[PDB]
Amino acid sequence: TLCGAELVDALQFVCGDRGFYFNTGIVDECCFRSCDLRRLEMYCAP
């Protein structure tokens, strides 16, 4: 599982120049339970 300050790095590994998409909780799917690649890449801007 990735929790906390991993995520800011973790999400960048899946987001990059694309930025991050906007307009339960994320830590739930990341910290509480194992988070795969798909949920990480979904948060980035399409």
């Binding site: 929790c3 998409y21 906007f22 994320i26």
Partner: protein
């Protein structure tokens, strides 16, 4: 005398008269409720016949009585106990002293509560009369508040007429009633001193005796007693203990209750050379010679309780003891004392419990496995809520039945685990082999309150690196990240100096801050994204040859839906490397002859561990002036965990809102050094050297010694040469001693004319050298006799041969 079956006595005194004719009680002896009777009623009655109590002796609220000296002046030794104590003397109004001087041994049981005038209570050393003082506890009484003038016999006259013993760091004289004294002292000839008159007692005979070697002269007996003397084991022909009784003695004991119907006496039987009150499990009786035998009728020993529940607060167990089955249990023992060795001694024989088990407010014991062959709880009767097992307020439990080998079965009922502060939840999940996981209902556990001070940590850390090469130790271990890397809030390193490998989780703790354990807190290390390198957290000791022990704990804040359990590391022993020694502990060298010096020293305890000693000797030069002088807190833990949870929640919140020449001797500390001059000083250097490939000495201690001189070595041999001149000048020359004691300093010249008095003169070393002898001037004419004596630093020599010289008129 006769073996009178046990009896109880109350407000009146006439019934007491039945004890005159019997020398042994086949049971228990009670004297209570002696309300409105006066001391004149008791001081005229004595029972020296009674020798034996088999069950229990008790006196309670007896008014008028002063002591048991006259009542039982020969009660020698006390099977079915009262509560925990053979002599229970409770709430006494006029009683003052114990008086059971002949009562010598109670191997099973102990002995005072709320007696406002009974003194001489703690002066008796109970370690020998009773097996374990752990059951004994002196409480509110007259002697509870120290106001007694405990004057033992002979102390007033200053004579040690009675033995003195040491306990709790204090060595004082002991006595029973200030006229008699102890019956328990030497055991195996430990303290003794005088006992009866002046001699110790051997091992087989217990306290007090007139002669050690002779068992007959030993009044008491430790293990067994033939009719006349103690024996290491009771001979074939010839008791419940401490004694030996012939086969018919037990036959007579059995026949006594065979023909007499009394509720309280006991069919005494024989088994295993013993006169035991009852046969063991699987043994029955068929009359004959009354020897217990087995049979093909194997039946368990069943206790049939009248009260229904033998509420266990040690005679509860003892009445239960011997029973392989109990037909009815609740335990409420307190005090924190480990009486459990007794409990398994009694309950270890229990193999079945028809009723249920309840354990409430228990504080004394530490482990539950003392039900060694329990193997079954029938639970015919159960607690409210139908609990075959009940545990509550259990403030000292640590370990349940180790289900590794145990195979308990529960016929019916449930279990109850509530307020189990020091109980490991792993143990609770371990009981679910018992077959209690399924069944009808499930009401067994109170989750939160089980494991409050103690716990059950599951994860162990593989300790990696340790460095103890000096008086300091580095510790490096594996770093552990929980599923949530925040959830580990640090590491709780625990360690304490462990002399022996008997260390457990707690090892005691003091509320005044005098905790045995040493605790430090290590913040979690920084981490990187790549798992290739993790900066392993470490620590270092604050100050070596003793042994040291380390075991690591974590710190995790619990969460409702998180499986967080923390981490642990086992206890591990490490020791340092060699250190410098200390100086030989205060040596001294004293010259033991004119040519020898004996040196002695001590082993310095500043270094502790493997121990040679080096001894240098060096001459000291003589003084120059002698050659020229003319001689003639949880309150903050709740906080910290709350703010830690708050920090984690705030961060995840922000994410959810942002995302999508010497001699040496070994171990011996004395030496003789020879080959020394008679009157010189030798300085000796001491080096204690705790290592022998390059031997490692310490700093040195400097001592010295001057050998004893020899005065006769200063004597001048032969007469004194003399010359006479015409001007009344007489010149004298002598011989210097070959080996003077240190240095000759002056000469004494004595001369006397024929028929006249004597005169003396001193010639210093400077005077002797300047004049090349000694010249006397102005001597009157006539004949003179002269002698010369030498003098050195050590002392004086001997006079030379007289010399006669004449001066012409």
């Amino acid at each position: 005398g006769e073996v009178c079956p046990g009896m109880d006595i109350r407000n009146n005194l006439t019934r007491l008269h039945e004890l005159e004719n019997c020398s042994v009680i086949e049971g228990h002896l009670q004297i209570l409720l002696m309300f409105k009777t006066r001391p004149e009623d008791f001081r005229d009655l004595s029972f020296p016949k009674l020798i034996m109590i088999t069950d229990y002796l008790l006196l309670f609220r007896v008014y008028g009585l002063e002591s048991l000296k006259d009542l039982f002046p020969n009660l020698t030794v006390i099977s079915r106990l009262f509560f925990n104590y053979a002599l229970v003397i409770f709430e006494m109004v006029h009683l003052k002293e114990l008086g059971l001087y002949n009562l010598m041994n109670i191997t099973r049981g102990s002995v005072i509560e709320k007696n406002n005038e009974l003194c001489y209570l703690a002066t008796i050393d109970w370690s020998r009369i009773l097996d374990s003082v752990e059951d004994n506890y002196i409480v509110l009484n007259k002697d509870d508040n120290e106001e007694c003038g405990d004057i033992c016999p002979g102390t007033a006259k200053g004579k040690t007429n009675c033995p003195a013993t040491v306990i709790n760091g204090q060595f004082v004289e002991r006595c029973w009633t200030h006229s008699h004294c102890q019956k328990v002292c030497p055991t195996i000839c430990k303290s003794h001193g005088c006992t009866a008159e002046g001699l110790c007692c051997h091992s087989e005979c217990l306290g007090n005796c007139s002669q050690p070697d002779d068992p007959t002269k030993c009044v008491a007996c430790r293990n067994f007693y033939l009719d006349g003397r103690c024996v290491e084991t009771c001979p074939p022909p010839y008791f419940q203990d401490w004694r030996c009784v012939n086969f018919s003695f037990c036959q007579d004991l059995h026949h006594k209750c065979k023909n007499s119907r009394r509720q309280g006496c006991h069919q005494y039987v024989i088994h295993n050379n013993k006169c035991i009150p009852e046969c063991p499990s699987g043994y029955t009786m068929n009359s004959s010679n009354l020897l217990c035998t087995p049979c093909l009728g194997p039946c368990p020993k069943v206790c049939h309780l009248l009260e229904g529940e033998k509420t266990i607060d040690v005679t509860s167990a003892q009445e239960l003891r011997g029973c392989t089955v109990i037909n009815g249990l609740i335990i409420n023992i307190r005090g924190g004392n480990n009486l459990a060795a007794e409990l398994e001694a009694n309950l270890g024989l229990i193999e079945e419990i028809s009723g249920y088990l309840k354990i409430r407010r228990s504080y004394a014991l530490v482990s539950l496995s003392f039900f060694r062959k329990l193997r079954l709880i029938r639970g015919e009767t159960l607690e409210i809520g139908n609990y075959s097992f009940y545990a509550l307020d259990n403030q000292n439990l640590r370990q349940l039945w180790d289900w590794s080998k145990h195979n308990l079965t529960i016929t019916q009922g449930k279990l109850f685990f509530h307020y189990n502060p020091k109980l490991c939840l792993s143990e609770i999940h371990k009981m679910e082999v018992s077959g209690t996981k399924g069944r009808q209902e499930r009401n067994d556990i109170a989750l939160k309150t089980n494991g409050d001070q103690a716990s059950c940590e599951n994860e162990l850390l593989k300790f990696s690196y340790i460095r103890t090469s000096f008086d300091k130790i580095l510790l490096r271990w594996e770093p552990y990240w929980p599923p949530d890397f925040r959830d580990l809030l640090g590491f709780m390193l625990f360690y304490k100096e462990a002399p022996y490998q008997n260390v457990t989780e707690f090892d005691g703790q003091d509320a005044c801050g005098s905790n045995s354990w040493t605790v430090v807190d290590i913040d979690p290390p920084l981490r990187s994204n790549d798992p290739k390198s993790q900066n392993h957290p470490g620590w270092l000791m604050r100050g070596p040859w003793t042994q040291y022990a380390i075991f690591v704990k974590t710190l995790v804040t619990f969460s409702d839906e998180r499986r967080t359990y923390g981490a642990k590391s086992d206890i591990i022993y490490v020791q340092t490397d060699a250190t410098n020694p200390s100086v030989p502990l205060d040596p001294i060298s004293v010259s033991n002859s004119s040519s020898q010096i004996i040196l002695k020293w001590k082993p310095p305890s500043d270094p502790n561990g493997n121990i040679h000693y080096l001894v240098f000797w060096e001459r000291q030069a003589e003084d120059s002036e002698l050659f020229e002088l003319d001689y003639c807190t949880d309150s903050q833990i709740l906080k910290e965990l709350e703010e830690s949870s708050f920090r984690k929640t705030f961060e995840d919140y922000l994410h959810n809102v942002v995302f999508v020449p010497f001699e040496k001797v070994v171990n011996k500390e004395s030496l003789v050094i020879s080959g020394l001059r008679h009157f010189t000083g030798y300085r000796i250097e001491l080096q204690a050297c705790n290592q022998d490939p390059e031997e490692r000495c310490s700093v040195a201690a400097y001592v010295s010694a001057r050998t004893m001189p020899e005065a006769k070595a200063d004597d001048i041999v032969g007469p004194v040469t003399h010359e006479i001149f015409e001007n009344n000048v007489v010149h004298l020359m002598w011989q210097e001693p070959k080996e003077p004691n240190g240095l000759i300093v002056l000469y004494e010249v004595s001369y006397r004319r024929y028929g006249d008095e004597e005169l003396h003169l001193c010639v210093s070393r400077k005077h002797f050298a300047l004049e090349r002898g000694c010249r006397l001037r102005g001597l009157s004419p006539g004949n003179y006799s002269v002698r010369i004596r030498a003098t050195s630093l050590a002392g004086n020599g001997s006079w030379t041969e007289p010399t006669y010289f004449y001066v012409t008129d």
